[PDB]
Amino acid sequence: SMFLPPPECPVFEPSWEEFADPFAFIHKIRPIAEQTGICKVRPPPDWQPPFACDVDKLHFTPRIQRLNELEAQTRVKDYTLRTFGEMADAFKSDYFNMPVHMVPTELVEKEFWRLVSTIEEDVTVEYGADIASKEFGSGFPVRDIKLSPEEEEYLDSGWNLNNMPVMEQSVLAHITADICGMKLPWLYVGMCFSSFCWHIEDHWSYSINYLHWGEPKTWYGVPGYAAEQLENVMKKLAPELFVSQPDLLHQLVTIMNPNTLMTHEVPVYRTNQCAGEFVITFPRAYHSGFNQGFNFAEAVNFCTVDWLPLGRQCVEHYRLLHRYCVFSHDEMICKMASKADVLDVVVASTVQKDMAIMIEDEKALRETVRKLGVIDSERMDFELLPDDERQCVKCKTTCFMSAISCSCKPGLLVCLHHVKELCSCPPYKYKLRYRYTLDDLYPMMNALKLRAE
Numbered sequence: 017s018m019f020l021p022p023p024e025c026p027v028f029e030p031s032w033e034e035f036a037d038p039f040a041f042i043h044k045i046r047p048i049a050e051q052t053g054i055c056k057v058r059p060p061p062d063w064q065p066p067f068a069c070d071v072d073k074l075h076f077t078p079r080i081q082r083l084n085e086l087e088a089q090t091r092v093k094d095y096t097l098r099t100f101g102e103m104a105d106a107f108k109s110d111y112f113n114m115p116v117h118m119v120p121t122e123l124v125e126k127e128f129w130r131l132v133s134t135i136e137e138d139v140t141v142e143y144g145a146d147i148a149s150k151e152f153g154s155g156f157p158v159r160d161i162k163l164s165p166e167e168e169e170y171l172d173s174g175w176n177l178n179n180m181p182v183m184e185q186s187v188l189a190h191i192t193a194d195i196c197g198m199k200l201p202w203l204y205v206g207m208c209f210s211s212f213c214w215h216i217e218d219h220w221s222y223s224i225n226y227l228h229w230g231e232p233k234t235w236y237g238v239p240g241y242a243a244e245q246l247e248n249v250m251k252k253l254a255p256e257l258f259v260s261q262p263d264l265l266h267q268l269v270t271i272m273n274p275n276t277l278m279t280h281e282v283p284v285y286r287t288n289q290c291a292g293e294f295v296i297t298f299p300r301a302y303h304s305g306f307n308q309g310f311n312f313a314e315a316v317n318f319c320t321v322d323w324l325p326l327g328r329q330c331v332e333h334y335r336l337l338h339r340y341c342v343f344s345h346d347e348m349i350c351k352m353a354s355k356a357d358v359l360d361v362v363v364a365s366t367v368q369k370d371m372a373i374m375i376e377d378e379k380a381l382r383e384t385v386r387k388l389g390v391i392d393s394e395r396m397d398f399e400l401l402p403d404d405e406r407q408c409v410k411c412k413t414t415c416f417m418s419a420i421s422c423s424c425k426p427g428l429l430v431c432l433h434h435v436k437e438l439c440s441c442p443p444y445k446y447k448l449r450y451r452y453t454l455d456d457l458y459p460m461m462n463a464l465k466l467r468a469e
């Protein structure tokens with residue numbers, strides 16, 4: 017009547033043999049899990065990474081959160097772990113007039129959706145979210161301090177979320193252009209009702225979340241194929257979230273009842289993630305949720321070979337929306353081509369196919385701007401420019417393969433889709449700036465082909 021819980025998402029329990037290689041495992045479950053957007057992974061019973069920390073020496077600055085459905089929040093923006101924990105336990109204890117382990121999960125869920133929909137309730141909560149640093153580090157073992165033999169067992173686990181971004185079957189690895197918010201783990205300190213709004217990952221990447229300890233985290237997920245249905249439902253009910261934003265640090269997001277989505281025929285799934293379990297989200301899969309109580313989680317983005325074509329589609333979609341990029345997809349592709357001899361052979365093969373499309377599109381774009389009367393040209397090392405100095409004036413895309421400039425407007429650039437948007441001068445005053453000639457590009461793709469055999 018009031019809240020009807022969505023159906024449960026898939027839960028996998030891999031054997032030690034299946035578990036050994038995360039990328040092989042993720043590829044295996046993909047046909048099931050991409051139908052639901054999120055899934056849960058329970059490691060083998062004896063896989064237990066040790067967790068240890070001083071609750072008095074870890075400090076962090078908390079964010080404050082109002083809990084109202086459809087109200088705008090911004091995506092990104094002092095306690096010790098002990099003092100936060102004391103605040104969190106007392107809050108839950110007093111809210112329900114109960115001891116915390118006796119508060120049923122079904123009840124916290126029901127109550128969460130009651131309180132966010134009710135205008136006359138003004139519940140505020142706090143939480144932590146930050147990338148690993150010296151003041152607050154990874155929950156997984158890392159190399160530095162002498163480690164116990166148990167900790168060194170987990171140092172090079174593929175499921176140690178520090179290693180995940182730099183494994184061989186991973187794609188975001190050899191990226192030199194720093195993208196700190198996308199290759200490093202984030203740490204999250206939760207309390208009862210603190211929540212994460214509906215969103216998808218930057219560049220439509222995968223994400224993987226590990227709950228180290230504490231009370232469960234409740235998740236809702238939507239499969240990738242339904243991303244645009246969800247957005248249309250959201251646009252109708254809260255248009256303010258969809259106005260154009262001046263940068264990446266101004267993304268607007270919101271809390272919204274999954275029953276609202278289910279009423280509009282958007283498929284939604286749920287899960288309670290407990291301590292010691294993994295949740296994985298797939299490309300373009302919308303997700304949100306809330307914490308049941310005091311807890312500690314760690315998460316990281318990643319990109320497999322399966323993702324490469326979607327990554328190209330994502331940047332195209334960013335262009336239509338005038339959304340800023342975190343990195344240049346074409347720059348990453350060419351960086352990998354330049355390292356073709358050390359690439360894994362399946363990677364080399366998949367990169368080669370994306371490069372072939374890149375080259376065909378670039379050929380056609382250069383033919384088009386030549387016919388507009390752009391004649392002069394000069395080579396340019398785009399990867400050396402800071403990102404804010406190579407975004408298209410019109411669509412904000414990060415340039416790499418090519419761009420148009422004019423001496424009339426020093427420093428400004430447009431991508432080749434927006435030649436008409438640079439300035440009022442005739443096109444013979446423009447220059448085509450390019451990273452590679454077509455003749456440079458075909459040998460790069462050939463090296464990939466040889467490596468792939």
Ligand SMILES: O=C(O)c1cc2ccc3ccccc3c2s1
Nearest residue numbers: 024025026027047048051052285
């Ligand atoms: O091809 C198959 O055998 C399966 C398809 C689905 C679809 C949604 C699902 C949602 C929750 C749990 C399992 C599924 C499965 S299993």
Ligand SMILES: [Cl-]
Nearest residue numbers: 083131134137
């Ligand atoms: Cl409220």
Ligand SMILES: [Mn+2]
Nearest residue numbers: 215216217223
């Ligand atoms: Mn996420």
Ligand SMILES: [Zn+2]
Nearest residue numbers: 408411431434
């Ligand atoms: Zn553009």
Ligand SMILES: [Zn+2]
Nearest residue numbers: 422424439441
């Ligand atoms: Zn001009």
